[PDB]
């Protein structure tokens, strides 16, 4: 008697899954009756309660009302709700900025401690004056009467010591970082482009510790002097739009402006306006105590033998960046994988040294 | 650590003057300057360095201890924190002498830097310094310097952060431009405060204290308007949080500068009131 | 361009009219004849204007030697307004005690270092002087700016040139 | 004890009540269930509700529906609804817009060691790249060293490269996805610089592969001048795939091989220990 009294308690456990699962389907077919509303938004006041509006799903359909709601919510520039048949405005909906992965990345911060990157200590503290400033007390612009900067600029190479200093040192200062890929923006069929990047800065209105990081872009960089372009004519046409972010009535101090490249060429004097673009962070080759915090990170990753010396790899460094750290282990431990052990001798990773000095440019 | 043995070197600071001390003890002060810098903020302790500028003090002259302490802000001082304690504790001696050594604390009040430029000091310690410097030019004959000290010394320590300490030097100030005879200068001393305290709890003698003092601008313009207006807020303050002792003898002079203005939109509520018909009888005839 | 005609105390500015310069064609009707089109309505729209001369249309532009050529004749586009920099010391000096006027300066700190050597600017160059120089006393948490600040920011204020050096030219 | 006499005859019956339910429903279901309806795509994750946008370029509003799991709703998310009352049906798979724009699929070529020769010396360098992180993972994370995903190689072919970079499929026993260089740039504004995050997705998602550039010439000649700014999608099409390796990583399925005739653009950014290690000549 007591073999079933187990096996009937799973059985009723089972049956909630047999029937919890087709009863929100139950709720669907009753919903026939009323078909999925369509877009809309407020554009302006024309009547009393019925207003202007234009869905974004086809032509300019001005629909009715409904008295479920009052006019407080039906200004402008908030999502409705409207029927395609009775058309009229069913409730209000909360203004939706549709979080797409190009609108909001789905990566955020970092889950990476500090710079592994790093170990200049003027450049990269040079920035967190002008973003941890706002942050707590903007009492130090008040009394000086400027605006605050938003200024940050980076060249050289891509990728070493550049590209990944946005999910390093924006991830520890506790702010919304939302990666804006150039590659994500570039709507090959009818491109919308910069109006995308326009619905991105209603989190900073809503949330103002939000970080947005442009990577590694040259492709606005040229401006075509000849202007026999084909596609790229809309190009500089979408900038245009970028450049009204920081001209126009947005103004904030929060969202901070960082635009990378590869090469000072003939990338767009107004963008590199002394108040659009600020800090300019160089890539240089720096002494031993540039590249002293990256190689600490760079021991402890390699389980080796507690005897070297990595103070006379420093002079044999030329040409080489924190990338370039980074092969020195990781060729030096491939002549490791065959000898059964995982060991690398001083003078064995000096070998990989030199070996990255070769295969340099 | 390290500190164990410079209570070795706490001998000569007895027997021994303290100049010797201000070069051969001057050294070791060196040697626990470099063992951090900028590099860190704390590496240990930062309180024995300012002890120890505390025992220079009393010892030697006050003369050769503030040429000592200008060259320790040209460059480092340890933490920015520990600048604080080797001044400040080091003007406490000062407190239980004065005499002579007034002149000499001005000198020490040139010789820092947070006078002129605020650096990092943010507490409103220095600036009592120099209101205290102020007390003494009254006794002097100083006058139209003083309003200038601490005007724009004020917003240097703490501009939005602490009003309390900004209190007592806004009342100070226009209590200067009283004695100098200008009643338009206090009036523009006085605006980015406004009503906010009337916004946070009653702290009672604050506002008692504010419009005491704006009555005797409009003393000088011979204005009744405005004062009954500075006696509106202490009217109902007297009637909740204190007393009637002090409350009814100032509702005599409020009723009585009601009738030296053609009445108002205000005054016309003041007409009727329920307290103003009992004990003297003249607050009846003015009623 | 109705609301021109109807409220007259009105004025329509339209920002960095360059997005088009000279011409396209290409896909014809695709991504191109959007502004085409403009041309012609520009020639439309500005035909009712004069009627009530309250219309106020300002366009901005970078390179104006690339634009329309045709927009100058008279009824559309009648006299463009020319900015050069040019900037001698008597223009540059208003701009100075501008927005320092609400920043308390020491009386030691002077730009005639910087006034009298700097030649041809734009108010670019003058407004980052409030912003590197009053940068520069946020690192250092300075509450005035010196004169040694200023000329400290004078290297990367003005020249830009991160690359070889400036004005190869005499060396 | 007398209960389950009539509680076992109940809930036997309530089969066809509950679990058949579902099925039940679906008569007038499935013909809206069959693949001739309108797709969508979902846009989004008061009460509880969503937002989905077809591909017609509608967007529609709905409710909260239990025809999809919480886990299931994910931004641009390929989906299906109906051609009126706009309900989801059926999910479309990941991989929004189109995969790799070209492909050849070879499981395993002829081409293998014995059919190459003199390129022992590269392939003994070759296996500590690729093959030996695809499996064994142990030696590498207790050294720190993250393998890369590929290397780069020009020379004439027959010797290597085409046939090479086959053999390489064949041994690991891994997805073969090729798609041409000259293939990757396009006519219009980041048509082929899209699919480079497009690619990886859905190498990583299904099954391991080895993705393979032919004739890297053709994105591959810049050099320093002024005219990249003729192609813009060409240079973006390069930093996304060296900036994407570290967020893409930490698996198996994604590798990135690039070959070529002859290399005449010097990068120095190329060098890294996730991004082109060997430069074969």
Same mark, same amino acid.
């Given at each position: 008697?007591?073999?079933?009294?187990?096996?009937?308690?799973?059985?009723?456990?089972?049956?909630?899954?047999?029937?919890?699962?087709?009863?929100?389907?139950?709720?669907?077919?009753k919903?026939?009756?009323?078909?999925?509303?369509?877009?809309?938004?407020?554009?302006?006041?024309?009547?009393?309660?019925?207003?202007?509006?234009?869905?974004?799903?086809?032509?300019?359909?001005i629909?009715?009302?409904?008295?479920?709601?009052?006019?407080?919510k039906?200004?402008?520039?908030?999502?409705?709700?409207?029927?395609?048949?009775?058309?009229?405005?069913?409730?209000?909906?909360?203004?939706?900025?549709?979080?797409?992965?190009?609108?909001?990345?789905?990566?955020?911060?970092?889950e990476?401690?500090?710079?592994?990157?790093?170990?200049?200590?003027?450049?990269?503290?040079?920035?967190?004056?002008?973003?941890?400033?706002?942050?707590?007390?903007?009492?130090?612009?008040?009394?000086?009467?400027?605006? %605050?900067?938003?200024?940050?600029?980076?060249?050289?190479?891509?990728?070493?010591?550049?590209?990944?200093?946005?999910?390093?040192?924006?991830?520890?200062i506790?702010?919304?970082?939302?990666?804006?890929?150039a590659?994500?923006?570039?709507?090959?069929?009818?491109?919308?482009?910069?109006?995308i990047?326009?619905?991105?800065?209603?989190?900073?209105?809503?949330?103002?510790?939000?970080?947005?990081?442009?990577?590694?872009?040259?492709?606005?960089?040229?401006?075509?002097?000849?202007?026999?372009?084909?596609?790229?004519?809309?190009?500089?046409?979408?900038?245009?739009?970028?450049?009204?972010?920081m001209?126009?009535?947005?103004?904030?101090?929060?969202?901070?402006i960082?635009?990378?490249?590869?090469?000072?060429?003939?990338?767009? %004097?107004?963008?590199?306006? %002394?108040?659009?673009?600020?800090?300019?962070?160089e890539?240089?080759?720096?002494?031993?105590?540039?590249?002293?915090?990256?190689?600490?990170?760079?021991?402890?990753?390699?389980?080796?033998?507690?005897?070297?010396?990595?103070?006379?790899?420093?002079?044999?460094?030329?040409?080489?960046?924190?990338?370039?750290?980074?092969?020195?282990?990781?060729?030096?431990?491939?002549?490791?994988?065959?000898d059964?052990?995982?060991?690398?001798?001083?003078?064995?990773?000096?070998?990989?040294?030199?070996?990255?000095?070769?295969?340099?440019? | 650590?390290?500190?164990?043995?410079?209570?070795?070197?706490?001998?000569?600071?007895i027997?021994?003057?303290?100049?010797?001390?201000?070069?051969?003890?001057?050294?070791?002060?060196?040697?626990?300057?470099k063992?951090?810098?900028?590099?860190?903020?704390?590496?240990?302790?930062?309180?024995?360095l300012?002890?120890?500028?505390? =025992?220079?003090?009393?010892?030697?002259?006050?003369?050769?201890l503030?040429?000592?302490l200008?060259?320790?802000?040209?460059?480092?001082?340890?933490?920015?924190?520990?600048?604080?304690?080797?001044?400040?504790?080091?003007?406490?001696?000062?407190?239980?002498?004065?005499?002579?050594?007034?002149?000499?604390?001005?000198?020490?009040?040139?010789?820092?830097?947070?006078?002129?430029?605020?650096?990092?000091?943010?507490?409103?310690?220095?600036?009592?310094?120099?209101?205290?410097?102020?007390?003494?030019?009254?006794?002097?004959?100083?006058?139209?310097?003083?309003?200038?000290i601490?005007?724009?010394?004020?917003?240097?320590?703490?501009?939005?952060?602490?009003?309390?300490?900004?209190?007592?030097?806004?009342?100070?100030?226009?209590?200067?431009?009283?004695?100098?005879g200008?009643?338009?200068?206090?009036?523009? =001393?006085?605006?980015?405060?406004?009503?906010?305290?009337?916004?946070?709890?009653?702290?009672?003698?604050?506002?008692?204290?504010?419009?005491?003092?704006?009555?005797?601008?409009?003393?000088?313009?011979?204005?009744?308007?405005?004062?009954?207006?500075?006696?509106?807020?202490?009217?109902?303050?007297?009637?909740?949080?204190s007393?009637?002792?002090?409350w009814?003898?100032?509702?005599?002079?409020i009723?009585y500068?009601?009738?030296?203005?053609?009445?108002?939109?205000?005054?016309?509520d003041?007409?009727?009131?329920?307290?103003?018909?009992?004990? =003297?009888?003249?607050?009846?005839?003015?009623e | 361009?109705?609301?021109?005609?109807? $409220?007259?105390?009105?004025?329509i500015?339209?920002?960095?009219?360059?997005?088009?310069?000279?011409?396209?064609?290409?896909?014809?009707?695709?991504?191109?004849?959007?502004?085409?089109?403009?041309?012609?309505?520009?020639?439309?729209?500005?035909?009712?204007?004069?009627?009530?001369? $309250?219309?106020?249309?300002?366009?901005?532009?970078?390179?104006?030697?690339?634009?329309?050529?045709?927009?100058?004749?008279?009824?559309?586009?009648?006299?463009?307004?020319?900015?050069?920099?040019?900037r001698?010391?008597?223009?540059?000096?208003?701009i100075?005690?501008?927005?320092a006027?609400?920043?308390?300066?020491?009386?030691?700190?002077?730009?005639?270092?910087?006034?009298?050597?700097?030649?041809?600017?734009?108010?670019?160059?003058?407004?980052?002087?409030?912003?590197?120089?009053g940068?520069?006393?946020?690192?250092k948490?300075?509450?005035?700016?010196?004169?040694?600040?200023?000329?400290?920011?004078?290297?990367?204020?003005?020249?830009?040139?991160?690359?070889?050096?400036?004005?190869?030219?005499?060396? | 004890?007398?209960?389950?006499?009539?509680?076992?005859?109940?809930?036997?019956?309530?089969?066809?009540?509950?679990?058949?339910?579902?099925?039940?429903?679906?008569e007038?279901?499935?013909?809206?269930?069959?693949?001739?309806?309108?797709?969508?795509?979902?846009?989004?994750?008061?009460?509880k509700?969503?937002?989905?946008?077809?591909?017609?370029?509608?967007?529609?509003?709905?409710?909260?529906?239990?025809?999809?799991?919480?886990?299931?709703?994910?931004?641009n998310?390929?989906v299906?609804?109906?051609?009126?009352?706009?309900?989801?049906?059926?999910?479309?798979?990941?991989?929004?817009?189109?995969?790799?724009?070209?492909?050849?699929?070879?499981?395993?070529?002829?081409?293998?060691?014995?059919?190459?020769?003199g390129?022992?010396?590269?392939?003994?360098e070759?296996?500590?790249?690729?093959?030996?992180?695809?499996?064994?993972?142990?030696?590498?994370?207790?050294?720190?060293?993250?393998?890369?995903?590929?290397?780069?190689?020009?020379?004439?072919?027959?010797?290597?490269k085409?046939?090479?970079?086959?053999?390489?499929?064949a041994?690991?026993?891994?997805?073969?996805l090729?798609?041409?260089?000259?293939?990757?740039?396009?006519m219009?504004?980041?048509?082929?610089?899209?699919?480079?995050?497009?690619?990886?997705?859905?190498a990583?998602?299904?099954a391991?592969?080895?993705?393979?550039?032919?004739?890297?010439?053709?994105?591959?000649?810049?050099?320093f001048?002024?005219?990249?700014?003729?192609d813009?999608?060409?240079?973006?099409?390069?930093?996304?795939?060296?900036?994407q390796?570290?967020?893409?990583?930490?698996?198996?399925?994604?590798?990135?091989?690039?070959?070529?005739?002859?290399?005449?653009?010097?990068?120095?950014?190329?060098?890294?220990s996730?991004?082109?290690?060997?430069?074969?000549?």
């Open positions: 008697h007591r073999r079933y009294d187990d096996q009937l308690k799973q059985r009723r456990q089972n049956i909630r899954d047999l029937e919890k699962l087709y009863d929100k389907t139950e709720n669907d077919i919903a026939l009756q009323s078909i999925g509303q369509l877009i809309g938004e407020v554009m302006k006041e024309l009547s009393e309660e019925k207003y202007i509006v234009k869905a974004s799903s086809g032509p300019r359909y629909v009715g009302v409904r008295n479920s709601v009052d006019r407080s039906l200004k402008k520039g908030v999502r409705v709700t409207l029927d395609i048949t009775t058309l009229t405005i069913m409730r209000i909906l909360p203004r939706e900025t549709d979080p797409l992965v190009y609108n909001m990345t789905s990566f955020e911060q970092g990476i401690t500090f710079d592994g990157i790093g170990g200049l200590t003027e450049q990269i503290r040079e920035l967190r004056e002008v973003i941890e400033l706002p942050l707590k007390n903007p009492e130090i612009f008040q009394r000086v009467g400027i605006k %605050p900067p938003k200024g940050v600029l980076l060249y050289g190479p891509p990728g070493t010591g550049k590209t990944l200093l946005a999910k390093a040192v924006a991830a520890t506790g702010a919304n970082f939302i990666f804006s890929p590659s994500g923006i570039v709507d090959k069929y009818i491109g919308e482009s910069a109006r990047i326009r619905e991105m800065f209603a989190y900073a209105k809503e949330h103002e510790p939000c970080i947005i990081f442009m990577d590694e872009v040259d492709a606005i960089g040229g401006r075509r002097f000849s202007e026999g372009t084909s596609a790229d004519r809309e190009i500089q046409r979408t900038l245009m739009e970028l450049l009204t972010q001209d126009g009535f947005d103004n904030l101090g929060q969202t901070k960082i635009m990378a490249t590869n090469r000072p060429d003939t990338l767009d %004097p107004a963008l590199l306006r %002394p108040g659009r673009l600020d800090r300019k962070v890539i240089p080759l720096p002494n031993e105590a540039g590249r002293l915090e990256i190689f600490k990170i760079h021991t402890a990753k390699v389980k080796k033998t507690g005897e070297f010396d990595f103070e006379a790899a420093v002079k044999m460094s030329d040409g080489f960046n924190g990338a370039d750290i980074r092969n020195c282990a990781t060729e030096a431990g491939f002549f490791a994988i065959r059964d052990r995982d060991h690398i001798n001083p003078d064995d990773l000096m070998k990989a040294v030199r070996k990255v000095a070769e295969v340099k440019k | 650590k390290d500190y164990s043995q410079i209570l070795k070197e706490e001998f000569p600071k027997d021994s003057l303290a100049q010797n001390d201000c070069n051969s003890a001057l050294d070791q002060l060196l040697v626990l300057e063992k951090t810098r900028q590099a860190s903020d704390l590496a240990s302790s930062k309180e024995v300012a002890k120890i500028v505390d =025992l220079l003090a009393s010892r030697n002259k006050w003369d050769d503030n040429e000592q200008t060259l320790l802000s040209k460059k480092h001082g340890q933490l920015k924190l520990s600048i604080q304690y080797m001044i400040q504790k080091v003007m406490e001696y000062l407190k239980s002498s004065k005499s002579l050594d007034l002149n000499t604390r001005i000198s020490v009040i040139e010789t820092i830097r947070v006078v002129t430029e605020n650096k990092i000091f943010v507490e409103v310690e220095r600036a009592r310094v120099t209101k205290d410097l102020v007390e003494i030019k009254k006794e002097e004959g100083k006058i139209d310097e003083a309003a200038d601490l005007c724009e010394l004020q917003v240097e320590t703490y501009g939005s952060m602490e009003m309390s300490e900004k209190i007592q030097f806004i009342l100070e100030q226009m209590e200067l431009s009283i004695l100098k200008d009643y338009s200068q206090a009036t523009v =001393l006085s605006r980015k405060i406004l009503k906010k305290t009337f916004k946070n709890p009653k702290y009672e003698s604050l506002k008692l204290e504010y419009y005491n003092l704006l009555v005797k601008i409009s003393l000088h313009k011979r204005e009744y308007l405005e004062v009954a207006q500075y006696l509106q807020e202490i009217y109902q303050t007297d009637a909740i949080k007393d009637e002792a002090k009814k003898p100032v509702l005599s002079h009723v500068f009601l009738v030296l203005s053609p009445y108002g939109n205000l005054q016309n003041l007409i009727h009131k329920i307290q103003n018909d009992n004990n =003297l009888k003249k607050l009846e005839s003015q | 361009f109705r609301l021109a005609r109807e $409220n007259a105390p009105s004025i500015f339209i920002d960095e009219v360059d997005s088009i310069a000279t011409k396209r064609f290409d896909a014809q009707t695709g991504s191109d004849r959007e502004v085409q089109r403009i041309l012609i309505e520009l020639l439309t729209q500005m035909d009712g204007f004069d009627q009530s001369t $309250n219309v106020k249309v300002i366009m901005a532009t970078n390179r104006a030697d690339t634009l329309d050529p045709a927009l100058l004749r008279p009824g559309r586009l009648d006299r463009k307004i020319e900015f050069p920099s040019l001698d010391r008597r223009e540059r000096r208003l100075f005690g501008t927005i006027s609400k920043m308390s300066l020491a009386p030691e700190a002077d730009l005639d270092s910087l006034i009298i050597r700097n030649d041809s600017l734009s108010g670019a160059v003058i407004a980052a002087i409030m912003q590197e120089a940068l520069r006393a946020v690192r948490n300075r509450y005035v700016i010196l004169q040694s600040d200023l000329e400290e920011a004078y290297a990367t204020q003005v020249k830009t040139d991160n690359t070889v050096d400036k004005f190869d030219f005499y060396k | 004890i007398r209960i389950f006499r009539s509680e076992l005859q109940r809930l036997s019956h309530e089969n066809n009540v509950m679990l058949e339910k579902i099925k039940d429903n679906k007038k279901i499935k013909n809206n269930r069959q693949l001739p309806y309108l797709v969508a795509n979902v846009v989004e994750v008061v009460g509700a969503a937002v989905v946008k077809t591909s017609s370029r509608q967007t529609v509003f709905l409710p909260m529906v239990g025809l999809v799991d919480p886990d299931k709703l994910k931004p998310d390929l299906g609804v109906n051609k009126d009352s706009y309900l989801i049906l059926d999910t479309l798979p990941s991989e929004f817009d189109s995969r790799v724009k070209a492909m050849e699929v070879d499981e395993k070529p002829t081409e293998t060691y014995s059919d190459v020769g390129l022992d010396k590269q392939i003994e070759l296996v500590e790249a690729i093959v030996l992180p695809m499996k064994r993972a142990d030696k590498f994370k207790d050294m720190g060293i993250r393998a890369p995903k590929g290397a780069l190689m020009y020379g004439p072919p027959g010797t290597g085409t046939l090479l970079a086959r053999a390489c499929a041994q690991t026993n891994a997805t073969f090729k798609l041409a260089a000259p293939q990757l740039v396009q219009y504004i980041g048509e082929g610089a899209k699919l480079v995050r497009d690619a990886f997705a859905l990583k998602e299904k391991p592969t080895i993705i393979f550039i032919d004739e890297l010439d053709a994105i591959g000649t810049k050099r001048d002024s005219e990249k700014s003729g813009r999608e060409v240079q973006r099409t390069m930093l996304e795939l060296l900036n390796l570290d967020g893409f990583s930490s698996d198996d399925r994604v590798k990135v091989l690039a070959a070529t005739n002859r290399v005449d653009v010097l990068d120095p950014a190329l060098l890294r996730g991004r082109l290690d060997r430069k074969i000549e």
